[PDB]
């Protein structure tokens, strides 16, 4: 009578896994995206006699840090980081966040943004002089040349804050930015200092890293697992009916 609940848990968590996979597939064109991993954990129920009931719980263990494919766009402000490297932005709630989106934009007032989040430099958020032409070097250095002026007068303005962090040290926040895990925060500090060993390419944008093969295989597996759980539910549903209706 309670195997129906085990099968129902399996089917519901299969639905959750399918939702995760569909959300990953919907962002196949999102610039600088990290796919969410999915794994079904097994929770064994601990009673006294025979733990013959073990349930299923869907989980998302971090994300995927494999870089995607770089689109070469003839623009100086689109940048791509090294493998396992992160650009730093000031988060929505006045905090710090890390990202791979190298689509740096400028405003009328001259401040750099990523998705609307101001970028964080050595001295705080980076502000470029109003209406200047901007070039980004291979180590984060930013040069600004005023329009209609000799290129000789170009001068550096600041340096981007580029950090290095692996998947174990990084957890996705609800606003799409990545942050440090508590266990990583305890060791590497609240704020990560700039890592000078990371090279950055200017003029190339990093796309998403969702793998179509894994997504399609996961969808097929989810469908089949759901059908099996429905069969288990149906088998349990007939037996209980007969039993009660007759042994009364």
């Amino acid at each position: 009578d309670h195997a129906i609940y085990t099968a129902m848990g399996a089917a519901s968590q299969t639905l959750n896994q399918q939702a995760v996979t569909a959300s990953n597939l919907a962002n196949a064109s999102t610039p600088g995206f990290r796919a969410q991993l999915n794994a079904l954990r097994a929770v064994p129920v601990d009673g006294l006699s025979l733990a013959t009931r073990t349930l299923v719980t869907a989980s998302t263990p971090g994300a995927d840090m494999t870089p995607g494919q770089l689109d070469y766009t003839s623009r100086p402000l689109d940048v791509a980081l090294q493998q396992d490297g992160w650009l730093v932005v000031q988060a929505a709630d006045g905090a710090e966040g890390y990202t791979r989106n190298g689509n740096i934009q400028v405003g009328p007032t001259g401040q750099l943004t990523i998705q609307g989040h101001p970028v964080i430099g050595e001295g705080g958020p980076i502000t470029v002089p109003e209406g200047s032409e901007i070039t980004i070097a291979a180590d984060g250095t930013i040069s600004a040349l005023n329009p209609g002026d000799p290129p000789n007068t170009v001068a550096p303005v600041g340096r981007l804050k580029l950090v290095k962090a692996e998947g174990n040290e990084v957890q996705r926040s609800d606003d799409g930015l990545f942050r440090l895990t508590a266990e990583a925060q305890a060791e590497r500090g609240a704020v990560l200092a700039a890592d000078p060993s990371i090279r950055i390419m200017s003029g190339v944008l990093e796309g998403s890293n969702v793998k179509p093969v894994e997504a399609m295989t996961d969808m097929i597996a989810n469908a089949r697992r759901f059908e099996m759980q429905m069969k288990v539910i149906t088998s349990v549903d007939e037996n209980e009916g007969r039993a009660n209706q007759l042994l009364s």
């Binding site: 639905l15 959300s23 689509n103 998705q115």
Partner: protein, 50 residues
């Protein structure tokens, strides 16, 4: 459910398709700047904390 998630995905690619069609229709226009569409994922839902 997943249906709307995938429907939002389909709507984004159609948008991108419309952007590409607009860019390709204005090939011979004088002084045209190409349009590039970027996408962002909406709010992540936390169900149970680690």
């Amino acid at each position: 459910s997943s249906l709307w998630i995938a429907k939002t995905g389909l709507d984004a690619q159609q948008t991108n398709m419309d952007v590409i069609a607009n860019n390709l229709a204005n090939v011979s226009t004088n002084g045209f700047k190409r349009q590039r569409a970027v996408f962002e994922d909406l709010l992540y839902q936390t169900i149970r904390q680690p």
